[PDB]
């Protein structure tokens with residue numbers, strides 16, 4: 113609705129952004145937990 | 154008409170198309186500024202040129218070795234031992250010369266007038282006019298350095314770099330050789346791919 | 352331009368002697384300072400011209416090392432020697448006093464000069480042969496001096512650096528060490544690892 | 546490096562041992578085939594994996610029995626500090642560079658504040674991947690890096 | 696070593712002062728001038744230089760000069776006297 117799109121991209125843009133970031137971080141950890149170092153070099 | 158790296162899209166404006174190998178490919182606007190563009194053009198040249206020899210140097214001996222015409226170690230192995238003089242000596246030598254010949258083309262890049270002083274005596278010079286496209290002894294055969302001819306050099310360089318990028322990454326994970334990697338793929342492609350390896 | 356294609360700084364018109372327009376830091380922007388510099392370069396050079404031979408010749412004989420000579424001073428009594436003979440004036444306190452007193456006087460004498468420290472080219476008793484009689488000829492010599500002086504300063508350095516790392520100093524010696532197997536013996540080995 | 550590698554540290558082994566016994570103790574009440582049991586056995590397996598990796602990656606340990614990090618620059622421990630860090634500075638630089646690309650795109654416009662509280666997502670998505678090559682900020686620095694007015 | 700060392704050092708120092716470094720030291724004093732707070736310092740201050748005590752019949756030197764050089768002389772000398780008996784030993 114243009115306008116609805118407009119409600120979005122407000123500080124709802126922050127939460128959608130951080131929720132995506134949180135998810136990504138969580139999955140990484142679930143995949144690679146307890147990492148104290150970068151061991152691939 | 155120019156070439157579009159992406160058909161639907163339009164080329165950026167700073168890309169006049171007066172440049173060899175121009176397909177309107179600057180999605181990140183690295184070359185929006187003209188100065189940056191000149192520098193980058195020169196950079197692409199050299200990164201492209203070294204890659205040509207390197208890919209060639211790396212690949213061909215591997216192929217010849219398999220043929221059995223000669224025996225040499227795989228590129229990722231030329232390094233350990235077996236040379237008259239150590240590794241250190243070669244380096245310092247490589248460095249002194251590379252340092253001179255470059256700290257050398259650099260001058261021609263800032264200001265294009267470093268063609269004289271050849272040799273120490275000034276009798277011999279380089280006559281011409283394009284940066285990164287020196288003449289004289291550099292071009293013993295005098296092939297026309299035709300624009301479009303330059304187009305070919307770049308394409309090869311660009312191609313070489315994907316190859317080079319390919320060789321190195323391929324090396325890890327694979328632990329073998331590019332020609333070897335190829336044979337494995339060739340022997341049975343559907344069962345040999347990045348998928349089976351990773 | 353003596354950096355091949357680099358514009359020369361404003362002050363250096365290449366008229367000075369030894370002027371190759373090199374001053375990436377522009378420590379010479381100030382005329383008063385530069386003049387001081389021209390004087391110093393020569394001083395530093397003059398010594399250096401003297402020092403390399405000083406260091407190099409004895410080693411060809413019994414010097415062993417410029418370093419080695421300094422060795423006695425550390426222990427009491429010295430006495431040190433010039434050519435197998437102790438003294439005269441063997442101990443450190445005597446030499447130190449003689450040096451400090453003899454030197455200070457000569458240099459301070461310098462610090463009583465105008466006309467650009469006699470243009471750092473005093474030419475009094477110093478130019479007996481009077482090479483400086485001819486201006487055209489005099490100029491050529493200055494260039495020789497500076498180029499030679501520079502060559503000397505640079506060499507001294509290498510001696511120190513070479514002397515470093517290779518505390519088994521052998522400025523003349525190292526060269527041998529290089530000569531033997533120049534390929535596996537070079538600074539390169541020194542720039543890296545065991 | 547007055548420490549001893551974790552692989553050969555008794556205290557480091559005592560901690561892995563004590564931790565597993567604590568989780569196993571809880572294992573008793575739930576019996577076997579059970580949800581909590583599988584959850585606890587999964588923590589135990591996650592525990593063993595953890596300690597195993599630390600030893601495996603040559604991390605020293607302290608008398609405490611816990612790994613300690615070397616940030617001196619020593620080559621054996623770049624994984625401990627330097628490698629991850631460069632990774633950071635890349636990302637931090639990325640975020641900052643993209644953020645500064647947006648303000649400059651926004652600055653010469655209408656009501657500039659309007660796009661600071663209501664994001665121009667088409668514009669942002671256009672500029673996000675420019676951070677990939679943000680260390681070619683260096684080449685902007687050779688010219689238009691920072692303002693001359695101040 | 697005897698007390699004679701004191702004399703040579705002090706003697707040499709004095710010598711140095713009177714004939715070598717003497718012209719230069721004064722040149723510097725002239726340039727440095729005396730201290731001034733907003734200008735001069737005698738203006739209040741009760742206290743100002745002693746011109747007479749400063750003045751001497753010798754062609755160049757003054758009593759105060761004697762004091763300083765002699766002091767350096769004595770100090771340098773005592774410096775050598777002490778380093779002797781320490782018998783300090785290093786590698």
Ligand SMILES: CC1=C[C@H](O)CC(C)(C)C1/C=C/C(C)=C/C=C/C(C)=C/C=C/C=C(C)/C=C/C=C(C)/C=C/C1=C(C)C[C@H](O)CC1(C)C
Nearest residue numbers: 179180181182200203204207210211228229231314317318
């Ligand atoms: C364009 C752009 C822009 C937009 O806007 C954005 C974007 C997209 C980002 C972009 C990007 C692009 C890219 C990707 C590029 C890349 C390149 C490369 C890769 C190169 C390489 C390159 C590469 C190279 C040089 C290489 C070289 C190599 C060599 C010589 C080698 C040699 C050798 C040999 C012989 C042998 C031995 O045994 C080894 C060695 C010794 C080693």
